[PDB]
Amino acid sequence: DPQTLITKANKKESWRYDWYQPSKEKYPFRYKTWLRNQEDEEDILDLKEFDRR
Amino acid sequence: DALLTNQLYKNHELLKLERKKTEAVARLKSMNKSAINQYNRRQDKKNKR
Amino acid sequence: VGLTLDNIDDINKAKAVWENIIIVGGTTSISGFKEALLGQLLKDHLIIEPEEEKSKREEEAKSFVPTIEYVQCPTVIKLAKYPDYFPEWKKSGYSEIIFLGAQIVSKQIFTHPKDTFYITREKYNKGPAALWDVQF
Amino acid sequence: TLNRKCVVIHNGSHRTVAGFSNVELPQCIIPSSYIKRTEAEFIFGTYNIDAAAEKRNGDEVYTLVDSQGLPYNWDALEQWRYLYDTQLKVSPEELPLVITPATNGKPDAILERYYELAFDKLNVPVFQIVIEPLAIALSGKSSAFVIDIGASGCNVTPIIDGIVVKNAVVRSKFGGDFLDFQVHERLAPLIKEEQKRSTDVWYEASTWIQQFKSTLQVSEKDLFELERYYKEQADIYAKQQENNPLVQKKNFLFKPLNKTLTLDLKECYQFAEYLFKPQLISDKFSPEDGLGPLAKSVKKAGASSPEQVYSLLLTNVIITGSTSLIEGEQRIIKELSIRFPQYKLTTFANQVDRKIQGWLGALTANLPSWSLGKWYSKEDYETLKRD
């Protein structure tokens, strides 16, 4: 499974592109920025097939 | 009593005036310090490359 | 390339880019495409005493040839060099040499501790805002 | 700083320079003009030159922004959609905004138009308007004497403790575009050629006039003074033996002819002399319209102690602008150190980045507090909509 290989690979936050409202308290506007996602926030080809040789 | 009353009214106005002066003074320092440190960090990662 | 490199307010970096013209891609296994591209660059954007005026002051010289001194930037137009010390890339060509410098960069930075150029997991713990922290 | 990705835009009189806060370079530097291709097609974009390389009939490079640094074609400037999508490739409604010429306090309106342009026309959820000569002073100085020789002219702005000396903000006429007219005028016999033509004139200002401009000069003294001094020097060198620096050829290769355009050193000096002495081009312009007595903007700043203003300005001179990147600052040092020798001219200048120094100052966006600048909410439009 692709996700099993992926979680088996490269061994941890997540991050989001979200509207933040900034603080001065909060501004009457808001704006997008990459906010920190917190803790609670397919198929395979075999290689050597596309290998140029 | 009259002169100390007038001085008491003079002091409050002076104190109120100073804060908005020093609000302009302290923001002048730190934003320039930010603009200095941005002018620092403009060159910092530059030489690393 | 002429309208790209002649619009620079810096008159000197224009010539240094003008003399390191690199043409890459899977098409660019074509021979002479880069060569006549360079020749057409010298045709369109090379600043010189032109053959009418350099011939005219060749004739003024035969009366040692001086040059009318121009002020513009693209006076020398050249290409750049490919590393011939990779026999795998000497053999399989340099049309996709972007992968070659990627291989050289990978042996550089990854076999180095330098995470000023790659995001770590802890660097993700700024995210892709640390992708803005790991650029070259 | 704070977790923000503001959009940093500098709108000069000729150049629209756009990128974000998290990129210290602009994503694009297109004109603040457009080849209105003729449908009307407001062709923004520098290379989109090539349309004006067609020199096409109906193609009309009108400016969006006149010589005051304020736009006169605002919905064709809403170029802003062209910026955010064709150049920035982002929604403006995502990101905050920093946008950059000083005035006397009257047009403080255009913000309402930016309330149009950032809330109604583009719906940028928050936009900060910064002062461009004050931004040039920022990128870490508090007070300055900013002279921007941009495309619009010589724009002099005194700045005392961050406040704008409103009576002393003077903007000259004579900068990039008048020198485009000048280089088109004087090399006219040598180019053998001699807005709508902005497709001829702006295109030539993109191809060869700039190629004579970044390659024009200013005399470090007055050119009449340098001319008499160098003629005296050459007379000394000739009479002692039995060379003038001004008799040498600065030939120009007019690439639409590939032809030698021999203008001398004094000849290329004479164009930028009109920025300090515009009586040499037309009688309706005084030497006061030149950059030397523009001294007057120091003196009008003396009324905000006037010698303390002189101390601050003439020891905190700032040089910026596109036409100031024409060689010759030392003209400013000479020309204002003769009108004010009292405080020695300790000048500051971005020397490269100078033509986009308002963009870099607006980029300094990357302030550590949203409270350091006025960031306009949609509610700030709603407050300005009342009374």
Swiss-Prot record, chain A:
Reported function: Probable component of the chromatin structure-remodeling complex (RSC) which is involved in transcription regulation and nucleosome positioning. RSC is responsible for the transfer of a histone octamer from a nucleosome core particle to naked DNA. The reaction requires ATP and involves an activated RSC-nucleosome intermediate. Remodeling reaction also involves DNA translocation, DNA twist and conformational change.
Note from the entry: Present with 1550 molecules/cell in log phase SD medium.
Cellular localization per UniProt: Nucleus
Name of the protein this chain belongs to: Regulator of Ty1 transposition protein 102
Shown residues within the full chain: 2 to 90 of 157
Domain of life: Eukaryota
Subunit structure: Interacts with STH1 and SWI3. Component of the two forms of the RSC complex composed of at least either RSC1 or RSC2, and ARP7, ARP9, LDB7, NPL6, RSC3, RSC30, RSC4, RSC58, RSC6, RSC8, RSC9, SFH1, STH1, HTL1 and probably RTT102. The complexes interact with histone and histone variant components of centromeric chromatin. Probable additional component of the SWI/SNF global transcription activator complex.
UniProtKB/Swiss-Prot annotation, chain B:
Subcellular location field: Nucleus
N-terminal signal peptide: none
Assembly mode: Component of the SWI/SNF global transcription activator complex. The 1.14 MDa SWI/SNF complex is composed of 11 different subunits: one copy each of SWI1, SNF2/SWI2, SNF5, SNF12/SWP73, ARP7/SWP61, ARP9/SWP59; two copies each of SWI3, SNF6, SNF11, SWP82; and three copies of TAF14/SWP29.
Reported function: Involved in transcriptional activation. Catalytic component of the SWI/SNF complex, an ATP-dependent chromatin-remodeling complex, which is required for the positive and negative regulation of gene expression of a large number of genes. It changes chromatin structure by altering DNA-histone contacts within a nucleosome, leading eventually to a change in nucleosome position, thus facilitating or repressing binding of gene-specific transcription factors.
Additional remark text: Present with 217 molecules/cell in log phase SD medium.
Protein name (database record): Transcription regulatory protein SNF2
Organism listed in the record: Saccharomyces cerevisiae (strain ATCC 204508 / S288c) (Baker's yeast)
Classification lineage: Eukaryota, Fungi, Dikarya, Ascomycota, Saccharomycotina
Full-sequence portion shown in this chain: 578 to 626 of 1703
UniProtKB/Swiss-Prot annotation, chain C:
Top-level taxonomic group: Eukaryota
Record's subcellular location: Nucleus
Subunit composition and interactions: Forms a heterodimer with ARP7. Interacts with LDB7 and NPL6. Component of the two forms of the RSC complex composed of at least either RSC1 or RSC2, and ARP7, ARP9, LDB7, NPL6, RSC3, RSC30, RSC4, RSC58, RSC6, RSC8, RSC9, SFH1, STH1, HTL1 and probably RTT102. The complexes interact with histone and histone variant components of centromeric chromatin. Component of the SWI/SNF global transcription activator complex.
Sequence similarity: Belongs to the actin family.
UniProt function note: Component of the chromatin structure remodeling complex (RSC), which is involved in transcription regulation and nucleosome positioning. RSC is responsible for the transfer of a histone octamer from a nucleosome core particle to naked DNA. The reaction requires ATP and involves an activated RSC-nucleosome intermediate. Remodeling reaction also involves DNA translocation, DNA twist and conformational change.
Note: Present with 1790 molecules/cell in log phase SD medium.
Entry protein name: Actin-like protein ARP9
Gene symbol of the encoding locus: ARP9
Full-protein residues shown: 313 to 467 of 467
UniProtKB/Swiss-Prot annotation, chain D:
One annotated Gene Ontology cellular component of this protein: NuA4 histone acetyltransferase complex
InterPro entries attached to this UniProt entry: Actin, ATPase_NBD
SMART domains: ACTIN
Keywords assigned: Chromatin regulator, Nucleus, Transcription, Transcription regulation
Record has Transcription as a keyword: yes
Effect of residue 335 to K: Impaired heterodimerization with ARP9. Temperature-sensitive phenotype. Moderate suppressor of Ty phenotype
GO molecular function, one term: structural molecule activity
Disulfide bonds: none
Example of a GO biological process term: nucleosome disassembly
Name of a matching Pfam family: Actin
Classification via CDD domains: ASKHA_NBD_ScArp7-like
Localization of this protein: Nucleus
PANTHER family: ACTIN
SUBUNIT field: Forms a heterodimer with ARP9. Interacts with NPL6. Component of the two forms of the RSC complex composed of at least either RSC1 or RSC2, and ARP7, ARP9, LDB7, NPL6, RSC3, RSC30, RSC4, RSC58, RSC6, RSC8, RSC9, SFH1, STH1, HTL1 and probably RTT102. The complexes interact with histone and histone variant components of centromeric chromatin. Component of the SWI/SNF global transcription activator complex.
Family of the protein in this entry: Belongs to the actin family.
Biological function: Component of the chromatin structure remodeling complex (RSC), which is involved in transcription regulation and nucleosome positioning. RSC is responsible for the transfer of a histone octamer from a nucleosome core particle to naked DNA. The reaction requires ATP and involves an activated RSC-nucleosome intermediate. Remodeling reaction also involves DNA translocation, DNA twist and conformational change.
Miscellaneous note of the record: Present with 1360 molecules/cell in log phase SD medium.
